[PDB]
Every structure is written in structure tokens, then in C-alpha cells.
PDB file of C-alpha atoms in Angstrom:
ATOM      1  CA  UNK A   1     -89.942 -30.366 -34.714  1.00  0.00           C
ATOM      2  CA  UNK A   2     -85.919 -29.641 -35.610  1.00  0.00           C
ATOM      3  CA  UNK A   3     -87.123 -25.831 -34.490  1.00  0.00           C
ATOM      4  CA  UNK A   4     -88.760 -26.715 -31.076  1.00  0.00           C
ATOM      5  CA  UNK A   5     -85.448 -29.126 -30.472  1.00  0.00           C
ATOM      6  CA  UNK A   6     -83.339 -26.017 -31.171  1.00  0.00           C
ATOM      7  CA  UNK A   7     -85.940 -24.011 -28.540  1.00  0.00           C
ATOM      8  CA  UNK A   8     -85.236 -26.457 -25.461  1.00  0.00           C
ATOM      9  CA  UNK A   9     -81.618 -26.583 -26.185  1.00  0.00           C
ATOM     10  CA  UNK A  10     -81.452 -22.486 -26.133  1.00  0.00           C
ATOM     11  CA  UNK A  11     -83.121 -23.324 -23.107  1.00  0.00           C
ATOM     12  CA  UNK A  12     -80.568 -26.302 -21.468  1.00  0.00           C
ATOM     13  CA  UNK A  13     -77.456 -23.515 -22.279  1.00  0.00           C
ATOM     14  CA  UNK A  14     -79.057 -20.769 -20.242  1.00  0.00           C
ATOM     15  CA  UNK A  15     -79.776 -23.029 -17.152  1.00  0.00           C
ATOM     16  CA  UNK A  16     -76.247 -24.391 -17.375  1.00  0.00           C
ATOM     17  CA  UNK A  17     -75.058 -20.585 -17.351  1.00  0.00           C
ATOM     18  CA  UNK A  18     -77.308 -19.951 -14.480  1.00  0.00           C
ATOM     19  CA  UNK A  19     -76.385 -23.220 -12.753  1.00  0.00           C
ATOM     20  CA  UNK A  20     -72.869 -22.397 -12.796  1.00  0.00           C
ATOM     21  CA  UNK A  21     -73.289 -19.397 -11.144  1.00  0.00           C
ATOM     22  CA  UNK A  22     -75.107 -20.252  -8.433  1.00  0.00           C
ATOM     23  CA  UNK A  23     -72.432 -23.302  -8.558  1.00  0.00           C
ATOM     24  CA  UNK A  24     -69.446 -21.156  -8.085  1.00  0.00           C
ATOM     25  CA  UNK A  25     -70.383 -18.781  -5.816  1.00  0.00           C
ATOM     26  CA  UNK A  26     -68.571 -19.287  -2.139  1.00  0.00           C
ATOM     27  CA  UNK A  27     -72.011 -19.219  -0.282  1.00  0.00           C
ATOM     28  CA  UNK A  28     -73.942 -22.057  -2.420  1.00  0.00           C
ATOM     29  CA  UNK A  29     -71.144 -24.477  -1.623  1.00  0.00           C
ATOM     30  CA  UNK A  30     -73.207 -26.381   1.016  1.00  0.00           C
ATOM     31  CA  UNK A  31     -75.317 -26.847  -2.369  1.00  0.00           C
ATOM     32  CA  UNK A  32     -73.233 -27.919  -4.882  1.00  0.00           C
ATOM     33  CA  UNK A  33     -72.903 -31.689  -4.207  1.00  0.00           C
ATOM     34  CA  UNK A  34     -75.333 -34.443  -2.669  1.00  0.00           C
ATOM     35  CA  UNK A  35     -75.404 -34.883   1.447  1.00  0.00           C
ATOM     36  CA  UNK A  36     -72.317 -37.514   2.578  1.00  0.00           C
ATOM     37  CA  UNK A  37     -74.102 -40.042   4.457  1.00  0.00           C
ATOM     38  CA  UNK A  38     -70.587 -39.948   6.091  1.00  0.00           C
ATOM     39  CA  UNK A  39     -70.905 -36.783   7.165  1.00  0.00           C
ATOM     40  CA  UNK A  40     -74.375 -36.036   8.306  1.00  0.00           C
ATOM     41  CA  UNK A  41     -76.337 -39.734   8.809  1.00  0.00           C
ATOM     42  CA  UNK A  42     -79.527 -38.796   9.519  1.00  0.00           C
ATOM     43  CA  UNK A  43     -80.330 -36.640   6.690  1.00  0.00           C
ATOM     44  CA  UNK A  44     -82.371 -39.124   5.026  1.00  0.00           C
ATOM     45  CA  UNK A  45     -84.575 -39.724   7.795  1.00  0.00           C
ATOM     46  CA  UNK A  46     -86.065 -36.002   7.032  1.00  0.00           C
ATOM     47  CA  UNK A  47     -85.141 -34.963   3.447  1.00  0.00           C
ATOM     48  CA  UNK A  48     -87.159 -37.575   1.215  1.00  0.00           C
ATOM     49  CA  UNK A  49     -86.432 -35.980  -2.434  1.00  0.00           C
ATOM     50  CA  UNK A  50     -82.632 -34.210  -2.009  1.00  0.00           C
ATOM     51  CA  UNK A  51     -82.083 -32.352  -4.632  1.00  0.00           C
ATOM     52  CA  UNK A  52     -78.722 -30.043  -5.255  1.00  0.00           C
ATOM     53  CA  UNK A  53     -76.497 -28.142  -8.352  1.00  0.00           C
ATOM     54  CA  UNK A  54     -75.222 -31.274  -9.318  1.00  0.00           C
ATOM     55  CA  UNK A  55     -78.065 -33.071  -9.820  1.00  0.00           C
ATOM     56  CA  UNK A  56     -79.698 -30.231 -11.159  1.00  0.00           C
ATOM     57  CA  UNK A  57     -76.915 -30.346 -13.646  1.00  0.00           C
ATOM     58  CA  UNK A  58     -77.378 -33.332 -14.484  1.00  0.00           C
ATOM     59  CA  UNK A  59     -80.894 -33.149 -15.023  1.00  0.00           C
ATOM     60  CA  UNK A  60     -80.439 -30.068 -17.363  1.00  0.00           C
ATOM     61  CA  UNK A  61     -77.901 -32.689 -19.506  1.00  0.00           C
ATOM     62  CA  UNK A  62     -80.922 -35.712 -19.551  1.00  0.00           C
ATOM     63  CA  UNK A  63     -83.273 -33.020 -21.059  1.00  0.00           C
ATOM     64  CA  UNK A  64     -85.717 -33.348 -18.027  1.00  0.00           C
ATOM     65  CA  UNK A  65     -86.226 -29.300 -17.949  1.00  0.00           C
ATOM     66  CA  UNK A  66     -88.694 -28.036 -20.890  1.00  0.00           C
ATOM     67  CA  UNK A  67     -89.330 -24.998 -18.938  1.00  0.00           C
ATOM     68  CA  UNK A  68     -87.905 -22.228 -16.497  1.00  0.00           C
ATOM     69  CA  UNK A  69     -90.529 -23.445 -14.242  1.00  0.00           C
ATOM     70  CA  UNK A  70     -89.442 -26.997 -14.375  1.00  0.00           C
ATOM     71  CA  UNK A  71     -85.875 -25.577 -13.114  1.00  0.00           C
ATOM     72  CA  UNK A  72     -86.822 -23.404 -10.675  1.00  0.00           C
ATOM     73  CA  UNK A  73     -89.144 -26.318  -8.827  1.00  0.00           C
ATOM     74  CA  UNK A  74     -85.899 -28.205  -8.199  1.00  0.00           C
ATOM     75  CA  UNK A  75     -83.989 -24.794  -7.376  1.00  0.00           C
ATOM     76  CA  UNK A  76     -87.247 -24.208  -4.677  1.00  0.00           C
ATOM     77  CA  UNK A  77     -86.562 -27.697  -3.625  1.00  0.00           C
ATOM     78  CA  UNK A  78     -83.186 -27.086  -2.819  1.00  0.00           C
ATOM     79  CA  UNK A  79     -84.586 -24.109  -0.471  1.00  0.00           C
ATOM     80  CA  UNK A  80     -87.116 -26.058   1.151  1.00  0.00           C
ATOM     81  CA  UNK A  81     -85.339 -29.164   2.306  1.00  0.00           C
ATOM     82  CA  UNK A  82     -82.269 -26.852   3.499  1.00  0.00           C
ATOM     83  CA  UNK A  83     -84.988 -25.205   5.771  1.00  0.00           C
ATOM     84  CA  UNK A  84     -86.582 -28.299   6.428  1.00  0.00           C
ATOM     85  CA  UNK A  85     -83.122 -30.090   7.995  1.00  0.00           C
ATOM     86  CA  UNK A  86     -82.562 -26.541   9.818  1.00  0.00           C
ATOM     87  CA  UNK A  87     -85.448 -25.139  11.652  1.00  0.00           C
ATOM     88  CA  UNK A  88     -83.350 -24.346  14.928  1.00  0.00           C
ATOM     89  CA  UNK A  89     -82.333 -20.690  16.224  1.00  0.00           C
ATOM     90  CA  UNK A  90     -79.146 -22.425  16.281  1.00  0.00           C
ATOM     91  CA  UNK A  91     -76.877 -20.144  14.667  1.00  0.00           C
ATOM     92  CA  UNK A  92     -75.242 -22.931  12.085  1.00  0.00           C
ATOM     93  CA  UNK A  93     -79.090 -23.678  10.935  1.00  0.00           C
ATOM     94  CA  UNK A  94     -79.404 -19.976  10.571  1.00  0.00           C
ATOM     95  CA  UNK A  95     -76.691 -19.397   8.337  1.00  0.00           C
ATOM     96  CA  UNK A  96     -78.073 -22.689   5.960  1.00  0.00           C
ATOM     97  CA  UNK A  97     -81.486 -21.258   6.037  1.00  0.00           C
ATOM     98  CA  UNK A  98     -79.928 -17.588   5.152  1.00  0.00           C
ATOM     99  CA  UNK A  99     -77.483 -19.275   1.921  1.00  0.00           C
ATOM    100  CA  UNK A 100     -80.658 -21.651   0.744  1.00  0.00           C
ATOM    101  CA  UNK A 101     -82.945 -18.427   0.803  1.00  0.00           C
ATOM    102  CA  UNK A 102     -80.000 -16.259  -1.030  1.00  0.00           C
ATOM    103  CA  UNK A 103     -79.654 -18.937  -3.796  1.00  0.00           C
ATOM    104  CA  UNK A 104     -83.689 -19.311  -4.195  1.00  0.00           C
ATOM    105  CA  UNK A 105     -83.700 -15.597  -4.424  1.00  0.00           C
ATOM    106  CA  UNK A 106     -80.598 -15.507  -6.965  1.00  0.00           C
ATOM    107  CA  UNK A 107     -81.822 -17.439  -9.642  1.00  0.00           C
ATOM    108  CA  UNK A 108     -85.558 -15.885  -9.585  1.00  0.00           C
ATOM    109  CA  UNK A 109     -83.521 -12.840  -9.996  1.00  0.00           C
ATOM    110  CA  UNK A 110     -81.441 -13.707 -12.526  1.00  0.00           C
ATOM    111  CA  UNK A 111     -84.247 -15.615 -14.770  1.00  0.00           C
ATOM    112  CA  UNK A 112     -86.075 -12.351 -14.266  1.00  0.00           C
ATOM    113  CA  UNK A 113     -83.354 -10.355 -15.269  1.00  0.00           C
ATOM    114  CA  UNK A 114     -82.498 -12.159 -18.016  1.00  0.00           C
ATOM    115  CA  UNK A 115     -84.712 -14.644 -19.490  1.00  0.00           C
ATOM    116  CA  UNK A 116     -87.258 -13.248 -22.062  1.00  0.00           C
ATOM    117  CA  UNK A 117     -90.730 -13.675 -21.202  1.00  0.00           C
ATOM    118  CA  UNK A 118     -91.541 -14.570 -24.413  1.00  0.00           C
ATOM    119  CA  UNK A 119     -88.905 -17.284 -24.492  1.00  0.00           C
ATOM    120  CA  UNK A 120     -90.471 -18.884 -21.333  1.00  0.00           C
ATOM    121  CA  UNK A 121     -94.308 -19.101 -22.900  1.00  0.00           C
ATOM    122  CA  UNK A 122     -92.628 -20.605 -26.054  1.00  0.00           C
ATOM    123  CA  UNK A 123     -91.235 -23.376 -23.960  1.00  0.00           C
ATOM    124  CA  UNK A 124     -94.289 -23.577 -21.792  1.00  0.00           C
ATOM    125  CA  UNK A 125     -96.550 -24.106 -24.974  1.00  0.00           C
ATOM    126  CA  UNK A 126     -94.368 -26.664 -26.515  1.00  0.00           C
ATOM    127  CA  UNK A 127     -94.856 -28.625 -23.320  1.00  0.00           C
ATOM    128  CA  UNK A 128     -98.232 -28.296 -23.100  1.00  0.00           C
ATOM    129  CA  UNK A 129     -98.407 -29.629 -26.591  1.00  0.00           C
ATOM    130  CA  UNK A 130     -96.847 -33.036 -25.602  1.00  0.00           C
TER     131      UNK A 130
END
């Protein structure tokens, strides 16, 4: 219905505002934009579904998120493939692994913090209407 519509797009303008602040913030940077094969060449070979804020941005404007949980699966996919590409003590896989956990802890604490519980069951029983 025109109502439901007007639901998910409430929806798409909160995970842009969360997006964006994740996107902005100096220690998600890493995160913002796809891997360069330039840069690192043999990220493929391990990461088999990248996922990052742009993407996720672009996702939010193809209306492929109906629910916080739908979000936060790509935002835990971000976390997992960063700690997937840098399991050594090495001290420049530590610091990825410490940023991917900070931004998977971020947004749960924002959509916590901010997203009415209410609101979220809404969206989840439109979807499981479909």
C-alpha cells in the first residue's frame, strides 16, 4: 500500500543518516569505498561477497533494505570479511580488525539508540507479508 511505501522510505532516510555517519568518520575510511585491485591484488582470492558504505549506499537507494536487519547483515559483513583478510598479530591487521569491530559496534549502537522498536517489527511484518 501508499502507507507501507511511505514505511520503507522512513526507513531508507534513517539508514542513509546512519550510513553517513559511519561514512564520515576518520576511522571507517578503510570502509567507505570497494578494495582497488590496484592496490591490494589478492583480495579476491579470500573475500568472495565484499561489501562496503558505498555499496551499502547504494543498496539503501535500489530499495534492497525492508528491514534494520537487512542493513545490519551487510554492516556484519563488512566486519567479517575485514577480519577474514586480517587474522595476523601483525599490528596493521590489528588496527583493521579493531576499526571493522568499532563500526559493527557503532551502528548496533546507534539503531539501538535510536530506531524505535516498534518501527523495526512494522517493517519486519510488511516483509513477511510479501
Amino acid at each position: 500500500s501508499m502507507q507501507e511505501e511511505d514505511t520503507f522510505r522512513e526507513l531508507r532516510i534513517f539508514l542513509r543518516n546512519v550510513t553517513h555517519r559511519l561514512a564520515i568518520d576518520k576511522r571507517f575510511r578503510v570502509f567507505t569505498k570497494p578494495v582497488d585491485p590496484d592496490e591490494v591484488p589478492d583480495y579476491v582470492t579470500v573475500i568472495k561477497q565484499p561489501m562496503d558504505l558505498s555499496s551499502v549506499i547504494s543498496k539503501i537507494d535500489l530499495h534492497k533494505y525492508l528491514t534494520v536487519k537487512d542493513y545490519l547483515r551487510d554492516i556484519d559483513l563488512i566486519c567479517s570479511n575485514a577480519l577474514e583478510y586480517n587474522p595476523d598479530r601483525d599490528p596493521g591487521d590489528r588496527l583493521i580488525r579493531h576499526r571493522a569491530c568499532a563500526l559493527r559496534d557503532t551502528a548496533y549502537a546507534i539503531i539501538k539508540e535510536e530506531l524505535d522498536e516498534d518501527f523495526e517489527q512494522l517493517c519486519e511484518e510488511i516483509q513477511e507479508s510479501r
